[PDB]
Design a binder for this molecule. Structure first.
Ligand SMILES: [Zn+2]
Ligand SMILES: [Zn+2]
Length: 258
């Protein structure tokens, strides 16, 4: 019965009990202090190759909704920037709040955005995601802030299908979705070494967080809130505030690409 979540007795403040790495040296998310985050002119340009991205399904895993990608080959791929080698896109998901004033995981000078998008990639030095997720150089997550304003057309295909995966365990067919519609024009970014922001909280993530947010409408985000954490036949719990508070930076340095 007990499973990790975002509630009072299974949430971020409780995770350390069943996942002691929650209190580790490289935990995510962090606050991005733009005064101390010093620029690095050695950082190579970021390369985002999503032209042949091949989506498979959209699903409710009880924590968020995931858009899964075909990672059998080097289709949609992230290279450059702080990354050694090639990282294959496997899935994307969001974090959001109960209201437009909170919802992001990272903060920028303690500012919270309405939501955060995470594009998850794993390093082809390893055989698959299951092997990479255990290694400090295993994953690269591209983090993108959402701010409420203009409706994003590239998000509409996602929003129009959320009613078919309202509850945990539902996974719908979802092909030919273009993740490039979810990117801002500028790819300037901050980067630091970190972790998964959910259990198992493994410290295997090179974080790449873009400075430019994308704009969504209040209506699009409010559709996110119509999802439920629970499965069919369980008490309803709206899926809201599925974000982790920021964690101590400890000895890490956030580097700017710009
Ligand atoms: Zn627990
Ligand atoms: Zn995430």
């Amino acid at each position: 019965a007990h499973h990790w979540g975002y509630g009072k007795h299974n949430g971020p403040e409780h995770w350390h009990k069943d996942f002691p790495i929650a209190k580790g040296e490289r935990q995510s998310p962090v606050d991005i202090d733009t005064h101390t985050a010093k620029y690095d002119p050695s950082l190579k340009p970021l390369s985002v190759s999503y032209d042949q991205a091949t989506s498979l399904r959209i699903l409710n895993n009880g924590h968020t909704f995931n858009v899964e990608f075909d990672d059998s080959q080097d289709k949609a791929v992230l290279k450059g920037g702080p990354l050694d080698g090639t990282y294959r896109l496997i899935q994307f998901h969001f974090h959001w709040g109960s209201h437009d004033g909170q919802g992001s995981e990272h903060t920028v000078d303690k500012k919270k955005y309405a939501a955060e998008l995470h594009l998850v990639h794993w390093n082809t030095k390893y055989g698959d995601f299951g092997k990479a997720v255990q290694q400090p150089d295993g994953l690269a997550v591209l983090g993108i802030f959402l701010k409420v304003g203009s409706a994003l057309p590239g998000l509409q295909k996602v929003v129009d299908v959320l009613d078919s995966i309202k509850t945990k365990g539902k996974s719908a067919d979802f092909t030919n979705f273009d993740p490039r519609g979810l990117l801002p024009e500028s790819l300037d970014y901050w980067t630091y070494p970190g972790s998964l922001t959910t259990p198992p909280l493994l410290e295997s993530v090179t974080w790449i967080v873009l400075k430019e947010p994308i704009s969504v409408s209040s209506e699009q985000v409010s559709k996110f809130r119509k999802l439920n954490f629970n499965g069919e036949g369980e008490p309803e719990e709206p899926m809201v505030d599925n974000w982790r508070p920021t964690q101590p930076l400890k000895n890490r340095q956030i580097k700017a690409s710009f």
